[PDB]
Structures are given as structure tokens and as C-alpha cells.
């Protein structure tokens with residue numbers, strides 16, 4: 001109940017789409033008590049099958065060869081995080097051993113274990129396989145909040161699917177819920193924007209068609225400088241109330257040196273390894 | 281960091297508590313003083329429907345680590361330092377997230393009841409700032425003064441939105 | 457050794473023994489791995505160097521069982537870290553052996569073999585200035601069903617007996633359960649256990665059992681003509697059929713003729729071949745994996761790429 005409820009209420013959200021998906025859970029332990037009530041509430045697009053994802057007959061029972069993706073959820077409160085991650089990598093290799101082409105999304109408790117996931121020969125993030133590392137993202141949201149307090153709650157609100165709740169009173173919740181109503185979305189930039197510089201198209205999309213644009217695919221660039229200009233076929237990252245509002249980012253024409261200071265890549269600062277007695 | 285998100289009710293005493301309330305509605309979460317791993321549960325669904333989201337969030341949050349760093353750390357398990365070069369230095373030229381006080385010289389001219397859209401447009405053209413929200417004092421809309429210094433988060437305000445002089449601006453700013 | 461010392465210590469043709477283990481874990485019994493590799497059957501230049509990679513806290517409380525053997529080394533580390541395996545030149549070894557002491561401390565059929573499977577995948581997936589998939593590995597499995605996760609270019613079904621599976625047929629997986637049938641085999645014929653022990657242990661005889669029973673350590677002695685006479689016994693070997701004396705017949709020729717000439721000229725008594733998994737197929741393939749043919753019939757056909765299992769005399 002504690003692992004799937006927050007997931008279901010966002011996957012099956014009222015504002016999501018006209019077409020449904022998912023419907024398949026499998027787990028070795030039966031859904032006792034309240035969990036089954038939660039399945040009843042969603043019975044028209046949720047089904048549970050008792051089984052273990054290590055057994056290829058159970059993978060056949062839930063028709064893995066036909067699934068769009070497989071989602072692996074972690075025991076966030078386990079006594080041995082590396083045991084959980086090794087277990088979930090065992091689940092990943094079971095699934096990939098059964099079927100090369102299924103897309104996999106998995107929760108990882110500790111960062112270093114993500115390396116193991118890359119050893120599997122049929123895994124490729126270029127095709128949308130990826131791992132959500134909870135320690136990495138938790139401590140990162142906190143770290144960015146040390147630079148700008150409140151940023152963790154901003155980022156956390158950009159994923160969860162939320163409507164615009166209207167509030168008639170003047171309390172802080174009114175303005176807050178207005179801000180909560182949007183999500184991070186993405187769309188390909190209309191050819192009308194090609195050949196000219198990123199700040200100008202941010203200004204255009206914000207002013208004229210009310211979209212806030214954060215980043216572009218020059219692999220993945222947040223807020224790139226005025227020297228950089230839009231190539232054809234580029235993908236933009238937008239903050240917006242609903243996905244349908246972002247499509248006018250496409251449907252548009254004229255509508256109206258001797259010392260080591262850094263890591264080997266230059267991405268992070270670095271220094272020689274200190275004994276702990278030097279820093280205590 | 282909270283292990284159990286219901287315990288959020290004990291962090292503040294000048295607020296209203298009810299255990300049926302979702303965490304995101306509560307005052308210490310809206311202010312960004314509480315965080316719980318459960319708010320990442322919906323990142324599963326968000327990542328299924330759009331694989332680009334996890335990419336953006338990782339580059340925005342990790343400091344910008346790319347697959348080359350993942351490979352280097354996977355091989356060596358420690359961050360290996362290196363001598364600087366023009367390409368090494370080129371990798372520094374990316375944006376960092378920042379908070380700006382609206383009382384500062386370049387923007388106090390407009391943090392007087394003025395317009396968030398105008399602030400966005402001038403900061404974008406003159407400094408490439410791309411400010412994406414404000415951090416607003418919890419009582420600043422009230423007519424009475426207050427001693428409360430607590431602030432809460434407004435993401436992507438509309439163009440016409442009104443700027444009180446005490447506000448803080450979330451923004452992305454270039455290297456120098 | 458530390459990783460820098462190992463990296464400058466040029467190792468090749470060696471044996472790397474990756475051990476998952478812990479201060480409190482059950483003792484593996486590593487003397488029995490080292491002794492067959494230290495039979496007087498080999499010349500001192502012929503002995504393969506042995507490197508243990510693992511917890512020194514585990515290895516310390518076993519060292520006194522094997523400290524009387526030459527060409528043995530320890531790297532304190534983990535089989536899961538690329539840096540350690542690069543330091544011990546994993547791409548140049550003759551064998552990588554993967555073992556776990558932690559077989560009994562948790563029972564869930566998944567949790568029994570996690571580390572060994574991850575280690576084998578970690579080695580396979582490496583790159584060297586070749587990829588690591590060509591490295592010879594043998595993995596001990598606690599639960600034989602987990603064999604299905606060791607290879608990905610094969611067909612899996614849990615109802616399959618272990619001996620039918622590809623990594624077992626290739627000799628890259630081993631499980632204690634394959635010794636269950638040694639009970640029955642020994643009941644019906646007491647000579648089998650005798651032969652297998654002399655073939656497998658390095659040839660230990662009851663005098664060694666008595667000496668070890670009394671002293672619990674292998675006591676060294678000064679050499680004599682009789683001491684040296686005990687060296688003149690056969691050792692098991694693999695021969696590449698591309699070698700000068702036999703490439704004349706490894707061209708589509710006859711296994712029986714190969715047997716007969718190698719037996720008369722060298723007393724070789726070759727008892728099987730190790731055949732590339734795709735060598736019967738018409739198309740070329742990049743797969744270097746081999747599987748075992750025991751006692752082929754006289755008329756059996758010899759492809760030039762084959763390896764010969766044989767027994768060869770001392771010199």
C-alpha cells in the first residue's frame with residue numbers, strides 16, 4: 001500500500017490522458033487487507049497476478065513480450081540497501097534475459113550500484129532504459145536547496161501531475177496552488193524558431209504564447225548563452241499547466257596549470273586526498 | 281529529511297495540521313524546509329510517460345554529471361583529478377541556479393508593485409537570467425505587518441503577476 | 457599486494473581466485489584448490505601463479521593452510537571493482553575462479569548467488585586495449601537454477617536439468633549438486649571414487665592422508681631418488697590442434713588416427729575434444745565459447761580449431 005499508492009494516484013491521474021495503460025502488477029505475496037481495496041478502486045485498469053519476476057513462466061503469464069515497459073519498485077526502508085539493489089538488478093537481468101527489447105525503469109537505493117546496471121549487454125539508456133537513484137536525487141535536491149532555498153519543493157512539484165485548484169480566499173495557499181498546477185513537459189521546436197538565438201525564443205514563447213522554456217536538446221543545455229542558436233529538429237523543455245498547451249511550441253508559424261584544480265573532465269573542483277585528521 | 285511524511289506536522293507550530301492532507305499541501309513542505317523520499321514516487325510515472333524528464337532533472341540537480349563521469353567513477357570508484365586545458369575549462373561555461381534579492385540595484389526599480397513579465401524580459405535580455413519562480417513571504421499579501429520570515433514557492437507566475445519589494449527570485453545564471 | 461604493486465608485477469597465464477567472504481563467514485577450504493595446482497608433476501617454471509582477490513579479513517584466517525606453497529599472492533579488494541581486476545591483469549589469466557563463502561547465511565533462492573552473477577557480468581562487460589567476454593571464467597553456484605543468468609546468448613527453462621544448459625556444457629558453471637550422483641556411482645562401484653580422487657587431487661595417497669592427519673600441515677623434505685621417482689606420473693592437459701605435430705591431421709581428419717599416433721609417439725591417450733559452439737555451422741561467428749565431447753567414436757571428424765583433452769607424461 002505504501003509503495004504503490006503514491007504511484008497509482010499519479011499514473012492514473014484525472015488530467016493524464018484519454019487513453020489508459022498499465023493494469024499489470026505481479027508480486028510473490030498476495031495483496032492482503034487494504035491493498036486490495038486500493039485495487040478495487042481502480043479495478044477497470046488494474047490487475048494483480050501472484051508470481052515472481054525471476055521465473056520466466058511468470059514473465060510469460062504477464063505477457064512481457066507485449067509490454068510497453070516494466071517498472072521495478074524498491075523497498076526504501078530495507079536494512080541492507082546493497083542487497084536490495086543487487087536483488088533488483090537480478091530482477092532486471094531476469095527480465096532482459098527473457099526479452100531484449102522491453103523498456104525498464106527501476107528504483108535504486110544507492111548510487112554506486114547503478115554501475116552494475118550498465119554491465120547488462122541488452123540494457124541501453126539510448127532507448128529509454130533508466131534508473132531512478134533515490135540517494136542521488138534526494139541529496140541533490142537538498143544540495144540545490146543550499147544554493148536557493150525552496151528549490152527542492154519546486155522541483156518536486158514539477159513532476160507530480162496536479163490540476164489548478166481554485167481558492168477564493170486570499171491565503172498563501174491560493175498563490176501556491178496556482179504555482180503547483182504546472183509540470184515539466186517537452187516538445188520539438190517549430191521551424192519558425194530555427195537559426196536564431198536561444199534567449200530570443202525564450203522571450204518569444206513566454207511573451208506571445210505563454211510557455212516558459214528552460215532547456216534544449218549541444219546535447220542537453222539548460223539556459224544556453226546568447227551565442228547559441230536553434231538548430232532544426234531540436235527539442236525544447238517547457239514548464240506548463242497541461243501538455244496540450246505546449247503543442248503551440250510546434251504548431252506555430254506567424255499565428256499573430258601546474259596543479260590539479262579539477263576532476264579529469266573539468267566538471268567538478270578537486271584536491272589531493274586528505275587524511276581525516278587534517279579536516280576534523 | 282523525514283522518513284515518514286505524516287511526521288511533517290510536528291515541524292511547525294504556526295500552521296494547521298490534519299493527517300489526511302497530502303504532504304505537498306503542508307506549510308513546511310511549501311516553504312521548502314521538509315523533504316521526504318516519498319515525493320519521488322511520482323518520478324516513476326513521470327519518467328514512464330517522458331524519458332527526457334529524468335535526463336533534465338539529473339543534469340539540473342547533480343551538478344551536470346554526464347555519461348563520461350559515470351564511466352570514470354564506475355571504473356575507478358573515486359573522482360580522479362586532472363591538469364587543466366582549454367577544453368577542460370570550456371566545460372565550466374554552463375548555468376548555475378541562484379536566488380536574487382529584488383532589493384538589489386538593477387531590479388529594485390521594478391520590485392515596487394511592478395510586473396514579473398517585465399522583470400523576466402529585461403533580466404533575460406541584459407543578463408540571460410531566465411527567472412523561473414519567486415520565493416514569497418508567507419504573510420506579504422496580508423494588510424497587517426508580521427514578524428514571520430517564512431517564505432513559500434511560486435513556480436512560473438503569469439506575465440501580469442505583481443512583484444512585492446521583499447521577494448526572492450529563482451533564476452539560472454551564466455558562468456563568467 | 458596493493459593495486460600499484462600488482463599493476464607493476466607483470467602477471468600472465470596465472471589463476472585469479474575471486475572470493476566473496478567476510479570475517480565471520482564459513483571457511484571455504486582453499487588448500488584443496490591450491491594443492492592440485494602444486495603437484496610435483498609440473499616443473500617450477502610451469503606452475504601457474506595464483507592471486508586471491510578479496511577481503512583480507514577473510515583470507516588471513518585461512519592463510520596458514522596454504523602458506524607452504526610457491527607462487528601465491530593476495531590482493532585485498534573486491535571482485536566487483538574494475539580497478540582491482542585490471543591491476544591483476546584479468547585479461548591475461550588462464551582462469552578466473554569465482555567463489556563465495558556466504559552461501560549459507562541467507563536463504564531466498566535469489567539472494568544466494570547475487571554476487572557471483574554480478575561478478576561474472578562485471579568481468580564479461582570490460583574493455584581492454586578486446587572486450588572481456590573472451591576471458592575464461594568458472595563460477596560456483598549455490599543454487600543450480602540460477603545458471604540461467606550466467607549467459608544471454610542461450611535458451612533458458614527452469615525445468616531443464618543443469619547438465620543440459622550451455623554454461624555447464626561449456627564448463628563455465630559448477631554446482632555441488634552435480635556430486636549428488638557420486639553417492640550412487642560409488643555404491644555400485646567402489647573403484648570410481650579411488651580413480652577420481654587420484655585424478656583430481658593431484659594424486660594424494662594414504663601416506664599423505666596420514667601425514668596431514670598427524671601434523672595438519674604439509675611438511676617439506678629433502679630430495680632423494682625415490683622422492684623424485686614419485687614425480688613420474690601423468691598430468692592432464694589441453695592441446696591446440698593447430699600445433700606442428702597434429703595440424704597435418706586437424707584438417708577434417710580422423711580422431712581415431714589422431715589418438716593412435718599420439719598414443720604411440722607420445723603416450724598421450726587423448727580422451728575428448730573441446731569444440732567451438734558454432735564450428736558446425738556454415739556461417740562464420742564471433743563466438744569463442746567451446747563445449748565438451750567425451751570419448752568420440754573412431755570415425756569422428758577433426759576441425760582445425762579444436763582443443764584436445766589428453767593425459768601426458770612427465771619429462
Ligand SMILES: [Ca+2]
Pocket residue numbers: 157158159160161162180181182183
Ligand atoms: Ca505539478
Ligand SMILES: [Ca+2]
Pocket residue numbers: 288289290291292293294295296297
Ligand atoms: Ca503543526
Ligand SMILES: [Ca+2]
Pocket residue numbers: 097603604605606607608609610611612
Ligand atoms: Ca540465459
